[PDB]
Symmetry: D2
Subunit: 244 residues, 4 copies
């Protein structure tokens, strides 16, 4: 029970087959109580109920400061603490550089980058008061190698911005024992019928796509005491797609 | 004459003491014609005239699509091409994580990240038609080491986002011979404490960054794309 | 347990205060049977018996092909398989660039780099035949930041060489499901005040911190990780 | 003239079509006097003579401490200084992990890693006495991505070791204004080549001149604030 007695908040975890839900499931299996925060309250509550007993579902647009703060307050009122924050919320968009409109940039940057800032801002005060915590930020191999997988350049930019933000927060809050680390998943199977799949898989030494559970297990590592001396780390979960 | 016959557009180069102006000066010394794009028209025109003859100054907020489009069109009308784009425009703010407000995030992200996207989007079509080009993006050591110098976490995020965008554009446009690379300057001219962690024992100069931009803009780097080039005096070795 | 039913060979784990022994202890706690390989037979046997029941201690210089072959053969004859290889053996020397002599270079490079190659060469065939495995290599933050901690430039070079070797083996054997990853520990408890000032988490590393990262890489929790360099440095190097 | 008045020592530059010779040519074009150090004295002297006037060829196995020291002494006696050291000497071998014998490891590590240490050790004292210098070490994309190009794992290891050594020397000698930086070339000029080429965004293999031009940047005052840098010259083959 790596997360026995811990409380974890995971954004974007209402969807059944997503990385967020897989992380919630594994966290609950490891003894944590999980707060799922996503756009739809009913979907978030149903996901939390599916995890088991003692979990919570809340609704928030991660780019809405006041809604995020209100949701975090409800979580803190019930659980009294948040030990772990998984900033998993994020959207991709398979368009190319010259097709990125202002509204596309805003949507993609808001969910990943602004949402990570806002949710981290909302949780950090209680983590300081509680003597520490672990924040895991979701980036992407696209931020490191310059896309070429699915998400367009604004997604690569947003997820690279997440890395810069995470490292800056790691440095600022190390003295408060708030560890901040990032995951850079490769090509992960979620919601492969195109011939382009062959080229990508040919570039993965392990010879398979990633699973949501693979990312969840790396998040478990960073959320747990097994990584107590890690902060500012970028942990690649890409099957060798990017070795560097 | 490393940039003989070339045309370079440099954003944020109107101020005399900035990296942008230092880059414009060195580029002009190396034979390039320079288009300075900055917020103030008169300041940009005066900076261009200070470089010498044949240069141009235009006014645009890099985060304003309409103003950027008008500036690039004026530049192309006069020069017929843009060989080099230096996305130097950027602002910083020394505020910590919990104090970053929506307007702070928007301002800092807009000048660096959105500005790099908008200006690159405006110039890339002509570069594709003209057989290639060199785009240099300005990041920061803060994007790599997690701040701790001056700019707050939203600056670190914006400059890290610039790296991600630059690499994505490098991959997309390699077949068009549009090279896209980034500079990660260290502390460029409390200072004593930072200076103690710099192996070369001095702060960076605007000319140091300009010379690295010159390398990336010139044919000396014809086989480099997607590169992040540290200009930090050893402050960050990794 | 995370390593239930697994067999792990750990080099350099005879000493009680080392990263190797801490890794052996945590691996045994997680259900693995551990083969300790180190220079002294009696010390390695005593360390293996201290872990519990069903473990093994063998003597070998990791830079000696014949001794490594003999040790791996004895381990395979008893356990029939090696699921996990922790290339923890390594030595350091606090000497500066101009003072590194041929014998200093040879000793430091042999234990870390040549030893990682020789031990990996000896274990890979059985891993390939058995359907995969996990190899963890021990590097150092010194390989990334250019020393400045304790080990001299030949130590930084040796541990950087380990990274290059590990990545090359990761790429070669990915299709065989042999994962190869590296740890880059910071300053571990195995002048301190000055270094401590540059560590955001405000403490030095513990052998258990490195062991726990090795546990992650050795376990199925990292089944999709190969070619990774995993920093265990408390924020000393953020990059 | 980016290297006007400078003296540069380049190892492994005797061969006509190599990166070393291309670097020597470009350095000479930029005003430097070049000392070519390679295994064969006759080949090195002929290469230096081909550069133009005022250059020098010397013989040394970079893994022989005393021969390297004697060669550097001859260079310093003639030129009085060495401003720039290009540790270009290196050999590769296309053999896979399980086929690397002790002798293969020794040969590959000796030319690249031990040779870089020995030649740097031999030149650094004069650079300290002269107020600084620039040392450029030759690594490879193989050290970063884990091979897969041509050189086997021991080549990837040797070239990664070079990076670790270079960064350590950069940190040690920054106060002496001895800059130490590394180049990581990609695939530099059939099925294997075609497959690799398909993963290069710029759509071509590198040329020796591409690497030489990056060495010129690092050797020149254009990079005066760079030390400890790893500069990729790979056409986008590895973006990271």
């Amino acid at each position: 029970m790596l997360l026995q007695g811990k409380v974890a908040l995971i954004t974007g975890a209402a969807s059944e087959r997503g990385i967020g839900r897989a992380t919630a499931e594994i966290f609950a299996q490891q003894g944590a109580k999980v707060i799922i925060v996503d756009l739809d309250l009913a979907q978030s509550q149903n996901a939390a109920k599916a995890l088991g007993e003692g979990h919570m579902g809340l609704a928030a647009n991660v780019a809405n400061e006041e809604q995020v703060k209100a949701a975090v307050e409800q979580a803190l009122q019930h659980y009294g603490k948040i030990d772990i924050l998984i900033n998993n919320a994020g959207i991709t968009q398979p368009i190319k550089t010259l097709d990125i409109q202002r509204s596309d940039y805003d949507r993609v940057l808001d969910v990943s980058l602004r949402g990570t800032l806002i949710m981290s801002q909302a949780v950090i005060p209680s983590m300081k008061a509680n003597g520490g915590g672990s924040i895991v930020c979701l980036s992407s191999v696209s931020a490191q190698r310059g896309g070429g997988i699915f998400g367009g350049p604004h997604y690569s930019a947003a997820k690279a911005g997440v890395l810069g933000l995470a490292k800056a927060m790691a440095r600022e809050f190390g003295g408060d024992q708030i560890r901040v680390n990032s995951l850079t998943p490769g090509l992960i199977q979620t919601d492969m019928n195109d011939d382009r799949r062959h080229d990508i898989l040919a570039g993965i030494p392990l010879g398979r796509l990633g699973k949501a559970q693979d990312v969840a297990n790396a998040a478990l590592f960073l959320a747990s005491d097994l990584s107590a001396y890690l902060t500012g780390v970028t942990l690649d979960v890409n099957g060798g797609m990017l070795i560097h």
